Structure formats: structure tokens, C-alpha cells
Design a protein around this ligand. Structure first.
Ligand SMILES: O=C(N[C@H]1CC[C@H](O)CC1)c1ccc2c(c1)Cc1c(-c3ccc(-c4ccc(O)cc4)cc3)n[nH]c1-2
Length: 269
């Protein structure tokens, strides 16, 4: 057994947050870089079960568009999660403020996003907090869904389970989560992806939250796509947003039907 391989030099901080911090670790013998999350078990009444679900969910995942899970080390309060390192950075940082990015890149990123989501959904799981900062890129620039601290399984033994728990991030959350007591999980993730598409194509977020009390939301519902934020988006991908960002979740397009959308299969464009 090669000596010292177990040793991981904690090179630098990747991105701190409410949880704690995520440092970049490089193998002492192979120099294999990785990402280690530090979940502070501090306090005892809103920290335990939190990470326990996040870990069992990771033990299931396995797709080229989902951050890879390696292992987890326990030690009192300091829990260590070992996940794939993404030198690419966040999709967020590839979005030019107020401009977005070249339409071809967006289509490419959207494709990988759908691949990852189709997968998660396939095995009955919903991320529930899809946004540019949770979408990572690696060396080759391949999109990776990351952060399953909020995910929850919605299908077990072929039984779907309606959700009622509110979570996510207001600008990316779906409207039925603010107006209904219960809702289907799949459609909520589709709305998220939809908001991410617009962010990529226009560099700005359509609204603070999907509620009529919000200007831009009521305008979009009225289809005032002129001059407003959707003015920057070409009609092809704009047609797809009309289908995704549909209020009634039951009338909202399904992923299987997005794969058939015109702009989705338009070469380069
Ligand atoms: O955006 C980044 N840097 C910016 C560059 C421009 C400067 O202006 C500011 C910093 C950046 C670079 C490299 C990064 C990240 C973020 C996040 C991240 C990660 C990373 C991977 C997975 C998970 C994670 C996965 C699953 C789960 O259940 C919980 C957490 C969290 C964090 N690895 N490598 C990186």
C-alpha cells in the first residue's frame, strides 16, 4: 500500500457559506485535486439530520453532469464531504452582467443541465435549488449540478410524493410554491432551469419572485416581451421560455417535451 496517499493538503478556500467552508484539497502523493466541504455540526437542534440526508442522496447520484461524490469522514462536529473538484468555476461567473453570453454556449449549457435533471428525476430525486451558482464547470467546460443539501426524494417504490416544504431561492422559485400548500416536484425544477436560461441569454433576472405583486412578473404574464428583459432574447429560445415559465405547473412543459422544442435542436444557434 503506497504511503502518504491518504494525506490531502488543504490548498485553499473554494467558497464559504452559511454551512461553513469548502476548501480545495490536493493529494499529497498523486496531486489529485478535490473539493472538501466542512459541515459544522455545531449546536444540536437544527444541524444533525440536515447533512445525513445530503450524504445518502450523494451515495446514489452518478452522472457526468452531477458533481461526483467520493466519500465522507466523521469526527465529532467536523464532518468532511469529498466531492469532485471543478476548476471551471461557477456558471454564474460566465454570465456577463446585463449581457449574458453567446447563444451557442447557452444552448450547450442548457443541454447538460437537462441531462443532469432528467437523471436526478429518473431516480426520483429533486434538487430544489437550481441556479447559476449551483451549476459548476470543469476543465473541459462541462456543466455539473452541485449542492444537494436541499434535495429530497419525491418518488420511492414508484410512488410520487407531493411536496409542501418551501425552499430554494426566491428569484428561481416556481409560482405554485408561493400560492399552493402542495405541489409536484418535477415541474418546480423545470421552472428553475427556465429562469437559468434567461439569466444566460440576458444576464439579468426577470423578477424578485413569481408573484403578481411583482411588476415584471405581471408584465410577462401579459406577454409584454417588448423592450423589457425578454427584448434581449431571440424569438427562438424565447418561444421555449413562453413554454417553460408557464404559471399553472400542470400546463408547464415537461422536460421530455423540451427535448422536442425547436430551439433546443437548432444547430449551433
Ligand atoms: O466561482 C468560483 N470562483 C470565483 C472566480 C472569480 C472571482 O471574481 C470570485 C471567485 C469558483 C471556483 C471553483 C469552485 C467553485 C466556485 C465551487 C466549487 C466546488 C464545489 C463542488 C461541490 C459542492 C457540493 C456538492 C454536493 C452537495 O450535496 C453539497 C456541496 C460545493 C462546491 N468545487 N470547485 C469549485
Amino acid at each position: 500500500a503506497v504511503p502518504f496517499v491518504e494525506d490531502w493538503d488543504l490548498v485553499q478556500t473554494l467558497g464559504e457559506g452559511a454551512y461553513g467552508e469548502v476548501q480545495l484539497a490536493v493529494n499529497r502523493v498523486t496531486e489529485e485535486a478535490v473539493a472538501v466541504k466542512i459541515v459544522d455540526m455545531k449546536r444540536a437542534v437544527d444541524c444533525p439530520e440536515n447533512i445525513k440526508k445530503e450524504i445518502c442522496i450523494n451515495k446514489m447520484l452518478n452522472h457526468e453532469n452531477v458533481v461526483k461524490f467520493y466519500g465522507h469522514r466523521r469526527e465529532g462536529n467536523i464532518q468532511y464531504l469529498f466531492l469532485e473538484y471543478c476548476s471551471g468555476g461557477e456558471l454564474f461567473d460566465r454570465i456577463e452582467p446585463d449581457i449574458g453570453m453567446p447563444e451557442p454556449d447557452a444552448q450547450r449549457f442548457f443541454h447538460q443541465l437537462m441531462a443532469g435533471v432528467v437523471y436526478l428525476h429518473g431516480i426520483g430525486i429533486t434538487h430544489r435549488d437550481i441556479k447559476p451558482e449551483n451549476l459548476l464547470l470543469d476543465e473541459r467546460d462541462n456543466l455539473k449540478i452541485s449542492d444537494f443539501g436541499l434535495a429530497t426524494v419525491f418518488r420511492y417504490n414508484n410512488r410520487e410524493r407531493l411536496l409542501n416544504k418551501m425552499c430554494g431561492t426566491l428569484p428561481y422559485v416556481a409560482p405554485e410554491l408561493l400560492k399552493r400548500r402542495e405541489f409536484h416536484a418535477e415541474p418546480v425544477d423545470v421552472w428553475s432551469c427556465g429562469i437559468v436560461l434567461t439569466a444566460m441569454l440576458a444576464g439579468e433576472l426577470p423578477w424578485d419572485q413569481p408573484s403578481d405583486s411583482c411588476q415584471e412578473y405581471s408584465d410577462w404574464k401579459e406577454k409584454k416581451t417588448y423592450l423589457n428583459p425578454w427584448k434581449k432574447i431571440d424569438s427562438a429560445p424565447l418561444a421555449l421560455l413562453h413554454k417553460i415559465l408557464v404559471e399553472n405547473p400542470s400546463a408547464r412543459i415537461t422536460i421530455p417535451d423540451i427535448k422536442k422544442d425547436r430551439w433546443y435542436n437548432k444547430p449551433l444557434k
